[PDB]
Amino acid sequence: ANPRVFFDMTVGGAPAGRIVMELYKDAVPRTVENFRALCTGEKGVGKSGKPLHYKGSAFHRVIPDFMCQGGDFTRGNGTGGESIYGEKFADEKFVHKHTKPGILSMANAGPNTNGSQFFICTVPCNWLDGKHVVFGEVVEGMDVVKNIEKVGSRSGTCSKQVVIADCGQL
Amino acid sequence: XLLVTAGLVLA
């Protein structure tokens, strides 16, 4: 089966609901395995000395009519993050494109720099195709996504903090 | 522009 993982989100400390994501283990298993493990925290601590775990991390960059970005559990601002394999890992395959809201894809700093940061598209983003590895999609709680999207701004700054209060695997 | 980078956010 393709794994399903979840985030229980808060916005300004207030519960916002659950996002459930299906991960395309069938297509991009190495990328999926990283994300799945970062939802459970099972692999221990990274090079940063922080837990390899999304729990407690935030969506630090949210841009309406584009995407929600999170996963920087080491610096909280887009300058950190790391994978269960080490700081960075290769782009596995570009077999899926950024075709619809709810697509889940890896943020990076150029080719072969995947860590832990990810984004959820809120529009089709074809200009990202070939540059970011798509590895899953939101299957429930897209409303929670759209509610987070509204707290964002053009600068990416959020009006209230958007936190993955809890996370794990179903 | 509209990118998703991790440390130097560009146009």
Side-chain angles (χ1 to χ4, degrees), chain A residues 2 6 25 40 47 99 117-118 150:
Chain A
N2 279 345
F6 67 92
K25 175 172 182 178
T40 70
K47 310 300 190 178
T99 51
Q117 291 188 55
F118 62 88
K150 295 182 182 172

Side-chain angles (χ1 to χ4, degrees), chain A residues 33-84:
Chain A
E33 175 64 9
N34 181 61
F35 193 83
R36 184 203 68 68
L38 293 173
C39 292
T40 70
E42 66 195 63
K43 297 303 191 155
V45 163
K47 310 300 190 178
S48 65
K50 303 292 200 301
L52 293 165
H53 199 185
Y54 294 132
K55 184 175 179 190
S57 69
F59 283 69
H60 67 276
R61 181 165 172 271
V62 173
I63 297 177
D65 311 314
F66 179 25
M67 60 77 236
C68 307
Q69 176 178 0
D72 181 354
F73 58 75
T74 74
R75 295 256 255 158
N77 66 0
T79 69
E82 57 183 313
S83 82
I84 70 167

Side-chain angles (χ1 to χ4, degrees), chain A residues 52-157:
Chain A
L52 293 165
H53 199 185
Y54 294 132
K55 184 175 179 190
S57 69
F59 283 69
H60 67 276
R61 181 165 172 271
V62 173
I63 297 177
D65 311 314
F66 179 25
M67 60 77 236
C68 307
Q69 176 178 0
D72 181 354
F73 58 75
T74 74
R75 295 256 255 158
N77 66 0
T79 69
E82 57 183 313
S83 82
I84 70 167
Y85 307 117
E87 309 284 44
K88 298 318 173 7
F89 71 104
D91 296 315
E92 184 172 5
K93 297 202 151 159
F94 301 94
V95 71
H96 289 291
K97 289 177 175 52
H98 302 78
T99 51
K100 58 173 165 182
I103 286 293
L104 174 64
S105 184
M106 292 303 285
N108 60 48
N112 308 302
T113 61
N114 299 286
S116 55
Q117 291 188 55
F118 62 88
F119 59 105
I120 300 171
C121 296
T122 59
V123 297
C125 294
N126 65 12
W127 56 98
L128 306 180
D129 296 341
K131 294 167 204 79
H132 297 272
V133 173
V134 172
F135 65 94
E137 61 184 81
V138 173
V139 291
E140 288 299 346
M142 192 61 203
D143 64 317
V144 181
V145 179
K146 297 288 293 174
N147 292 338
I148 289 165
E149 183 184 21
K150 295 182 182 172
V151 154
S153 64
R154 287 174 188 279
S155 65
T157 300

